[PDB]
Amino acid sequence: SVLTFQQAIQRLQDYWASVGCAVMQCSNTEVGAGTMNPLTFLRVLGPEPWNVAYVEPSIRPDDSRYGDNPNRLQRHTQFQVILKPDPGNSQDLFLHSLSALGINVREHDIRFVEDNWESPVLGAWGLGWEVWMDGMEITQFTYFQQSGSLPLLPVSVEITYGLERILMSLQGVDHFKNIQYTKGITYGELFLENEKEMSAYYLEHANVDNIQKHFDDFEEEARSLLSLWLPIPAYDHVLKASHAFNILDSRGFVGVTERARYFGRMRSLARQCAQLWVKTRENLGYPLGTYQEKGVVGQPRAFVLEIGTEELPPHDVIEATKQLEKSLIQILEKRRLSHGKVRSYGTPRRLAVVVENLNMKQMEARFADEVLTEDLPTIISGISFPKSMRWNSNIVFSRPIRWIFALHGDLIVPFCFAGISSGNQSCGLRNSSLANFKVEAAELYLHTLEKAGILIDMQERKQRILHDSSILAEGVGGDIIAPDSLVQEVINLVEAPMPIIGRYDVSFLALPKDVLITVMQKHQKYFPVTSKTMGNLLPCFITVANGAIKEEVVRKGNEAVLRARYEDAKFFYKMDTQKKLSEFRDQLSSILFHERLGTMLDKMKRVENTVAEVALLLGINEKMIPAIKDAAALAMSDLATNIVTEFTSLAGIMARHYALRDGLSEQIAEALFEITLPRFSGDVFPKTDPGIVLAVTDRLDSLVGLFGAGCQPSSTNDPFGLRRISYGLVQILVENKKNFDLTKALTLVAEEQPITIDSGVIDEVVQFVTRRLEQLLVDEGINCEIVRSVLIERANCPYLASQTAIEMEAFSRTEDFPKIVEAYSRPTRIIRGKEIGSALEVDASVFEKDEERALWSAYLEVADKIHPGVDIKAFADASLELLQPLEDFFTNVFVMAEDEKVRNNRLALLTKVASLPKGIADLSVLP
Template sequence: MQQAGISVDTEQRKKTILEQSNNLAKGVGGCLVMQSSLLEEVVNLVEAPVPVLGKFSESFLVLPKDLLVMVMQKHQKYFALTDDKGTLLPYFIAVANGAINESVVKKGNEAVLRARYEDAKFFYELDTSKRFSEFRGQLNGILFHEKLGTMEDKMIRVESTINELGLALGLSEDKIQITREAASLAMSDLSTAVVTEFTSLSGIMARHYALREGYSEQVSEALFEITLPRFSGDILPETDAGTVLSIADRLDSLVGLFGAGCQPSSTNDPFGLRRISYGLVQVLVEKDRNLDLRHALEVAASVQSLKIDTVHQFVTRRLEQFLVDKGINPEVVRAILVERANWPGLAAKSAYKMETLSRGELLPKVVEAYSRPTRIVRGKDVDVDTQEDERIRKNRLALLRNISELPRGIADLSVLPGF
């Protein structure tokens, strides 16, 4: 097979693609924009990789970089090139398969990309012929859920929770005002021609269109950050406004979809509620946001007149999974969540600290010392002299009860080994 030019070794094909592509990029003063997922996909599409350098018209560089790169990567499986400052260059690298006529392949790929970019340019010019704020009203044509209304209905609900959630998260009035302004535009890009055609650019195009029209960087960035995190390992919101919007949007989805009877089963989760819930937990914990989960769910539910107990349990399970995924002992996680599940950020800090303690000698001794008085108070270890003075007996039991309640609000030590 090697004599026929076919490489059966995946790593060898990957090495060939990287080495030859980097050499082609250097030839035009560029750097390869390499997505690991795209590289893996391309490696498995070809048996005998032959990278080919192509070029497109510089006139297309007036389009947003994210749009151009997305068309290259997602639709054509091409690698983009930038200069050392990250500015997109009018070149791309396609990976052909086997013996080829390089000139023919180059022209063919350039023609295909040109057609794709002409479409993208048409959609972009269609969008920019209107004010970005006009797209908000068009969300009434996009159904969120038959029982929950359109995307416009959803974003009106989200917008109505911003004040209370912002205060609960400790935002100043100025930052709440920025968040309200962003909320009035959030998700509007779902109505744009570009995002309708290229859905993965949701949020990215909202930020671009907002900046283009002169909205502040804080508002524009929040329009992107409401979509974060989009997948496992994705970046998280950095701005206060973006964080509040991200939380508010996920709370609305969870409460609403649970209320509409869309709870996931063990094998089916068509609305991605596990992902939404996990993302909510991730934002609260990793951005260190001290939020009362039950209160936040009640804020979202008050707009929809729904109960939140089932949703609260669901999010708590995602919090448990999140902490276990971080390498914390499941028993430690459960001990903490008995008392602090309602405060995900605080629960995570406590779990990390207890996990550290559990690796030493102190925590087992604490659990052992705590277990005896707790069992006595719970009536599982009766070892109090029944013949002694009743007053003394009650005082001793009161003392034991005080000892048993010391961890209350922090952790339930009775679920730990050694109790």
């Protein structure tokens, strides 16, 4: 017999008590999570240590499903663990807790996947993970950085279990009602009627007027109690205000603007309770405690640096390894240290760089060990992330650094960082024979990792993932659908890829194929499988497990998770079948785009009113406009559907499906899907003309409106995703070979905006988009300056500019290029500052030497063969006709003649010569 719910509670309490926690009781006032319990929100504040564990019934009125959905609950049961300060081995304590539940962590696939917890109501945030057990989210795990808008010291670790989820996964039940609570009694027998009636209360019957006035009374009493220096009752009243607001929300009486003001009042009161609680603890003397904290130079040997971390997000692994390699190479150069090949490797738990054949000393001079002892700490410090965190010091990092391996040949490079000393020791796969190992020479590093089951090269990981998954899918007569985006994510969610094929119920094949593929890929990171013969989805998937796990266990686990996910999808689909897409569209007024911009419905009305002119500027025939406008009237209405509010990754897909299911046009349904493409780096692009028009218009509208709203992105904060929005816009225009007048269309949508848009806002957007086009072309493999020189003159049409960039990278290698460039550079350099040359017309009657008329005649013919819009080939070939005339001119004509009229005529001539490249490229940047 498998574990019962109350058995799980008892075992978690016993376990965490054996580690030194106090097993407490739940809040006797309604909280949405154990985090809101004073045992968490207040006790993380100040320096006093705090190690506690308690069950918490968490009440989220928004999740009321009357018990009808197999997994959604207005009351679920968290197990809340706070450890303060961080003991340093919190992950291991949690895995030990799992074993205490009878779980075999070796056979199961326990994964730490990025998920950062934050709370506006509480003014709190941290960084950490969601923990998957065989693909089931069972625990949120967080290093708390800030609470009550106060920075935290020491940092606490929060481990929050979802007991319903864990029991459903361990018992293998598909509905929460059938969880074994104790022998003979199921979860449903105790709680289904509660779920039913409490849902009825939260969604339909609660008196919203009295509850709003009660919210006000609670605010007033909280302020009163704070002013009386009584934080405990005051925060109690803050919790009551939060529950009241949650009920007003679930009843649907929080308007879209009121929401932020409500959160602001709750946050203000919470910050005040926090500061008052800290003052109170201070006045008490912090009674629970306080917190604190030669020979003959030899041959070049290999140098290995490995920073071991707790699981980093994939983006963080990529960018950390890039930065580490660049920084180390630069420092090695600046320190006269020579070396061979340099290669960097990454992994959720490790960042490594290998320098082959690193010299023992510098040129001209200390040993490399000394130089590195002093430069490596600031190299690691130099690594930066969009989000970092403290854990036991002032040092920040994406996730905690737990070991540091640094070896030059046979010798440790000694240094400290983040309170970690360097050594010759590393960690393998958890719960394995080489969970800890030591390497006695850098040249033995990779070998030893290979002996520990870790494939540290991300490309070898890609190859094994793909090869093994394809073998598995061929075994059932199928092919994996494994886009590179998802493969890239999976590569950095594992260290020892182990693909495993599992099955799902064929009943779910009755769901739309795009729905199953999206659920699989974007929510479970599974590879779908399609038949090699029929071209249809086989009821199969591949999961890339990590480590030496038991195939059978992991398979059944993930199978149960996927069944639950498809059941959620089926539930919300059936909920949507009753209405028709047009009925949903009016509920776009329930979603804020931005306070000073309006709802998604305001946004759509804007899009409708600009879509036809965007179409004409794209040069699509005047005959597709009606349909475009038609599609514009139904765009992103699926944002209001239940399925998309549950699965945000189905926007566009569901608009298409619910449109076809209404007999609407195939091309209109495709337009409704295309307006969202590309959805992510790797996605496909809109390919149908009205889809192109819709997508382009929506991106222009977001850009102009958000930039005029002051949401111009920064180096690290782009909450609205403007950078990828602009990148995708230029990508859409290039891939579909669409000529565009960027400034014209941006002014076009600038007129439709609810706010006033300046010419300066439009110029801001044009520059932002141009820089993303530069990024694109330097990412597709075009030289930097060759791109800049083109974009200076042709950025206003992204597709023409792209073409021109490629053509001049061809130009760049053709022998004549340098001579054409010099030909144009000399007149440009001479006429700099002499605006007189731009103010005069050349007067051929002022010529004095035949070389002047020769140059003038040649210029006039070349000006005829060169227009703004010409291809580079014609430009270069026509510029060839100036070479000899210009050489003759510069050998026999004195440019700075002492007669002002002749000198000015000569400057004007050189000015017209230098003006030919205008609107093609600016050779002032080219080599």
